[PDB]
Design an enzyme around this catalytic site. Structure first.
Site, PDB file in Angstrom:
ATOM      1  N   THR A  22      32.888 -14.326  -6.152  1.00  0.00           N
ATOM      2  CA  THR A  22      33.185 -14.339  -4.698  1.00  0.00           C
ATOM      3  C   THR A  22      34.449 -15.141  -4.384  1.00  0.00           C
ATOM      4  O   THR A  22      34.490 -16.372  -4.564  1.00  0.00           O
ATOM      5  CB  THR A  22      31.955 -14.882  -3.908  1.00  0.00           C
ATOM      6  OG1 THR A  22      30.906 -13.899  -3.923  1.00  0.00           O
ATOM      7  CG2 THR A  22      32.261 -15.050  -2.420  1.00  0.00           C
ATOM      8  N   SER A  28      27.229 -13.832  -9.130  1.00  0.00           N
ATOM      9  CA  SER A  28      28.404 -13.254  -9.759  1.00  0.00           C
ATOM     10  C   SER A  28      29.294 -14.322 -10.349  1.00  0.00           C
ATOM     11  O   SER A  28      29.634 -14.262 -11.541  1.00  0.00           O
ATOM     12  CB  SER A  28      29.174 -12.398  -8.748  1.00  0.00           C
ATOM     13  OG  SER A  28      30.116 -13.166  -8.001  1.00  0.00           O
ATOM     14  N   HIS A  55      19.122 -35.226   6.298  1.00  0.00           N
ATOM     15  CA  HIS A  55      17.821 -35.816   6.627  1.00  0.00           C
ATOM     16  C   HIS A  55      17.543 -37.060   5.779  1.00  0.00           C
ATOM     17  O   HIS A  55      16.943 -38.033   6.239  1.00  0.00           O
ATOM     18  CB  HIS A  55      16.699 -34.790   6.424  1.00  0.00           C
ATOM     19  CG  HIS A  55      16.708 -33.662   7.415  1.00  0.00           C
ATOM     20  ND1 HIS A  55      17.477 -33.687   8.562  1.00  0.00           N
ATOM     21  CD2 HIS A  55      16.044 -32.479   7.434  1.00  0.00           C
ATOM     22  CE1 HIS A  55      17.287 -32.569   9.243  1.00  0.00           C
ATOM     23  NE2 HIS A  55      16.422 -31.818   8.581  1.00  0.00           N
ATOM     24  N   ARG A  97      18.626 -30.789   4.422  1.00  0.00           N
ATOM     25  CA  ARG A  97      17.705 -31.780   3.863  1.00  0.00           C
ATOM     26  C   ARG A  97      18.422 -33.018   3.359  1.00  0.00           C
ATOM     27  O   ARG A  97      17.902 -34.122   3.494  1.00  0.00           O
ATOM     28  CB  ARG A  97      16.825 -31.176   2.768  1.00  0.00           C
ATOM     29  CG  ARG A  97      15.627 -32.029   2.362  1.00  0.00           C
ATOM     30  CD  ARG A  97      14.516 -32.129   3.416  1.00  0.00           C
ATOM     31  NE  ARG A  97      13.666 -30.946   3.509  1.00  0.00           N
ATOM     32  CZ  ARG A  97      13.378 -30.336   4.655  1.00  0.00           C
ATOM     33  NH1 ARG A  97      13.889 -30.782   5.812  1.00  0.00           N
ATOM     34  NH2 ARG A  97      12.590 -29.259   4.661  1.00  0.00           N
ATOM     35  N   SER A 125      22.989 -16.596   0.083  1.00  0.00           N
ATOM     36  CA  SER A 125      23.169 -17.791  -0.715  1.00  0.00           C
ATOM     37  C   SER A 125      23.743 -18.923   0.132  1.00  0.00           C
ATOM     38  O   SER A 125      23.376 -20.097  -0.065  1.00  0.00           O
ATOM     39  CB  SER A 125      24.087 -17.525  -1.913  1.00  0.00           C
ATOM     40  OG  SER A 125      23.571 -16.490  -2.731  1.00  0.00           O
ATOM     41  N   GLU A 156      18.610 -15.864  -4.887  1.00  0.00           N
ATOM     42  CA  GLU A 156      18.651 -16.630  -3.635  1.00  0.00           C
ATOM     43  C   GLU A 156      17.417 -17.523  -3.509  1.00  0.00           C
ATOM     44  O   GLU A 156      17.533 -18.713  -3.148  1.00  0.00           O
ATOM     45  CB  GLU A 156      18.826 -15.699  -2.412  1.00  0.00           C
ATOM     46  CG  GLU A 156      20.259 -15.196  -2.223  1.00  0.00           C
ATOM     47  CD  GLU A 156      20.354 -13.712  -1.893  1.00  0.00           C
ATOM     48  OE1 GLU A 156      19.387 -13.111  -1.355  1.00  0.00           O
ATOM     49  OE2 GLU A 156      21.424 -13.122  -2.163  1.00  0.00           O
TER      50      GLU A 156
END
Lengths: 184, 177
Positions: free
Chosen positions: A91, A88, A60, A57, A47, A152
């Site tokens: 974390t 979850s 960018h 990005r 993740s 993910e």
């Protein structure tokens, strides 16, 4: 199965998971990216990698984008956005990030399966992600993949779609698209 | 116009693109992964991120996975496999990687849009990716997103498809992981 059939199977999984996301929260995310002076992305493991690709990005596109927990990460200030991808929502690292962020009066946006989780509870904005036991028993979510994989992948496409909505709001396209990418 | 619609746009672009891949190549990549004693992934920028995702999941299955260019990457011995993701197949850092690897008698698989590119010409196994000028002029390849986005998303989906094939061949599922 053939590898290409697995690809297609994956893309099948990503359909049920995608659409299911609520526009109102999502489209609110893009407005926050437009206002806040600094934007931080965050995640653990795979993740984490997706969070990094989004920040890449954004940079960018010329936002002051950063990744929580890198060597040259600048200090967050009042008003800055923090975007957190966590299935979850538990974390411990990212809990701390949200908590610490709100204390500095930053804005926290959490993308998570569990809006009620420790991270979700802290978030100013929740983008609710599929994968709930309720979603699975519903027929609204199903997966063939090792844990994390679909979530993910949903992060990536969701992040990249946020890129599209920012281009739109800024009046650009994949042809005009001037990107601020490294040189050396 | 709305973010969830753009998601769908991306889904659309992936449906046309993704399955456009040759299985003969694909399943032989899975074959190679199960053969080599050490596996190295590789990429630059976002493609590099996808390759790190691959190596991590390969690690999880207990394969000898590494990522080219990290602090603790060990030396490649002959027979080892190196998987390289490169859209253009013309990234200088990766050309060297490809070159050096072959020059050391490692097996090289490259995931590029351009098989005859510098990296392509070095590879033992090519997995031709969608995006060519031909496919563009054909009307088969269209993307509304910044350059590389589609190729990169595709890399990730392919890598995770390859994981699934490896699980099948190893006789395990999502549970046993």
């Amino acid at each position: 199965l053939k590898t290409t059939e697995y690809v297609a199977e994956i893309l099948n999984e990503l359909h049920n998971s995608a659409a299911y996301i609520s526009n109102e929260e999502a489209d609110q995310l893009a407005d926050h990216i437009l206002s806040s002076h600094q934007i931080f992305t965050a995640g653990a493991g795979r993740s984490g990698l997706m969070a990094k690709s989004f920040a890449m990005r954004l940079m960018h596109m010329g936002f002051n984008a950063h990744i929580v927990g890198e060597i040259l990460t600048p200090p967050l200030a009042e008003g800055d956005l923090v975007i957190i991808g966590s299935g979850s929502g538990e974390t411990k690292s990212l809990i701390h990030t949200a908590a610490k962020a709100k204390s500095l009066h930053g804005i926290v946006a959490a993308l998570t399966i569990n809006p009620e989780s420790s991270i979700g509870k802290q978030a100013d904005l929740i983008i609710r992600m599929p994968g709930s036991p309720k979603d699975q028993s519903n027929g609204s979510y199903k997966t063939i993949q090792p844990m994390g994989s679909l979530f993910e992948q949903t992060l990536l496409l969701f992040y990249d779609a946020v890129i599209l909505k920012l281009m739109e709001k800024k009046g650009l396209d994949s042809e005009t698209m001037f990107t601020h990418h490294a040189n050396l």
